[PDB]
Design a protein around this ligand. Structure first.
Ligand SMILES: [Zn+2]
Ligand SMILES: [Zn+2]
Lengths: 161, 162
């Protein structure tokens, strides 16, 4: 019997992701913060660590997935069991790489802020999220736009440097 | 600063090794994809699919290899951008949309691959991320498909009967 996050709890999670975006901005990373909630527990967090780590794959979303995998390791739960019922709260539309990754992990729902004009994979440049692809992952659902103005303002100021 | 370029025979050599790795993947109940990454005439990363062993849907052969190259960098003192930007990837199956997006972001300049990826190919089959006009996200890269495609598709086909 799993627990479903209400609207106010969502706004609350997206608030915490924004604070993480602010932290990333200040560490000279792309301002992207994200959270993964399962059964009313925060099961993965992540900021962009591309500059720190010097590894271009390490977007907020990827850092999160590892934390959740670590979570499963320690709870004894299986990843399929967990990811299939997990909600992602991210500051920016997941890019094509992350969107293709989230399909493969089968996260059903993603709540994001602003559009990813450069490389966004939920409609901006491609819609991998809804792609009719039979034998690869599952499609997922998006609720875009939550505090987009702020998110995009961070993104913009970051792209000057 | 004088970097070494792998020849045709040397490419054929690395693809044979990627083929053996794909065999090992098959026999471990993994999607049969093996790959190598070569920098300045050195094997700087290897990888097979580990999705089942690891139970993480993103650990495609290419992602295993990238982690290994990053590990090689740590120990060689060389920077990731200086290495990946001159690394050739040798793979059994066309990189998927996820991996192709990654390879753009890592800025690997050349992928040599085997058979097509009909379900999730990102070099032309389903989408062509490799050659996409995307100004401020990674670099586009080049592909040499088809090296021993027949055997590569034969392995994949045999694998999809489970
Ligand atoms: Zn991303
Ligand atoms: Zn792949």
């Amino acid at each position: 019997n799993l627990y479903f996050q209400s609207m106010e709890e969502t706004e609350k999670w997206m608030e915490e992701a924004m604070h993480m975006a602010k932290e990333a901005l200040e560490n000279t990373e792309v301002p992207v913060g994200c959270l993964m909630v399962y059964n009313n527990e925060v099961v993965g967090k992540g900021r962009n660590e591309v500059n720190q780590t010097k590894n271009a794959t390490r977007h907020a979303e990827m850092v999160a997935i590892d934390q959740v995998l670590d979570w499963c390791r320690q709870s004894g739960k299986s990843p399929s069991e967990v990811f299939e019922h997990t909600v992602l709260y991210v500051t920016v539309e997941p890019c094509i790489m992350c969107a293709a990754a989230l399909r493969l992990m089968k996260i059903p729902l993603v709540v994001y802020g602003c559009q990813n004009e450069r490389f966004g994979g939920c409609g901006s440049v491609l819609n991998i999220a809804s792609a009719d692809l039979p034998n690869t992952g599952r499609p997922f659902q998006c609720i875009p736009g939550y505090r987009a103005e702020e998110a995009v303002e961070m993104l913009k100021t970051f792209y000057k440097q």
